[model samples]
Target: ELVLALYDYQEKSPREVTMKKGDILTLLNSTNKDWWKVEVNDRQGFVPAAYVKKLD
Candidate 1:
């Protein structure tokens, strides 16, 4: 399983869920470089790829 760290969310989006710093998410898809599909807080949505980091 791939995990991601939420670094920042300076810009808000209706499609994206609100995430705090250090929040972790599971990566679903990365076919699109700009936006990635992820699951967090029991909800799934597309978030900016730049705001997250892949975990080892």
Candidate 2:
């Protein structure tokens, strides 16, 4: 009920995280908006905001 992955993002660097469609994530920070800090499956990293949808 927070952030939902719209597409799979394969981690290409240590600063990025790998996520699949339908993955649920906790938003850690969105100050940047473009690149958000999120946590999923107990792992935390940055993800492109455009790849996710915000749930109300």
Candidate 3:
């Protein structure tokens, strides 16, 4: 069987981007600032830091 992972934003975090169920995040690249360019579903955005937790 194939497995998939999904991450959720934690509380008290800066909500720069929002995600929902069935959304696919494509990791493109990362910078020295620890920012990553990800494609959410069909939207492209940048996420700062890797603090999000993968949902169970």
Give the candidate number with the greatest lDDT.
Answer: 2
Ranking by TM-score: 2, 1, 3
Worst 10 residues of 3 by lDDT: 1-10
Quantify all predictions' global Cα lDDT against the true fold: 0.53, 0.61, 0.42
lDDT of 1 by residue, 16-54 (tens): 565566655665666345465556656555656454544
lDDT of 2 by residue, 1-56 (tens): 45666675757743467777666666665634446566765565566645455442
RMSD of each: 4.4, 3.8, 7.2
Candidates 2 and 3, the one with greater lDDT: 2
Off by over 4 Å in 2: 12-16, 31-34
What value does the lDDT take at residue 6 in candidate 1?
47
lDDT of 3 by residue, 1-56 (tens): 11122444322454545544424445444434345555545455654425333312
lDDT of 1 at 13: 53
Q: What is the TM-score of each candidate against the true structure?
A: 0.48, 0.56, 0.35
Candidate 2: Cα lDDT at 11: 74
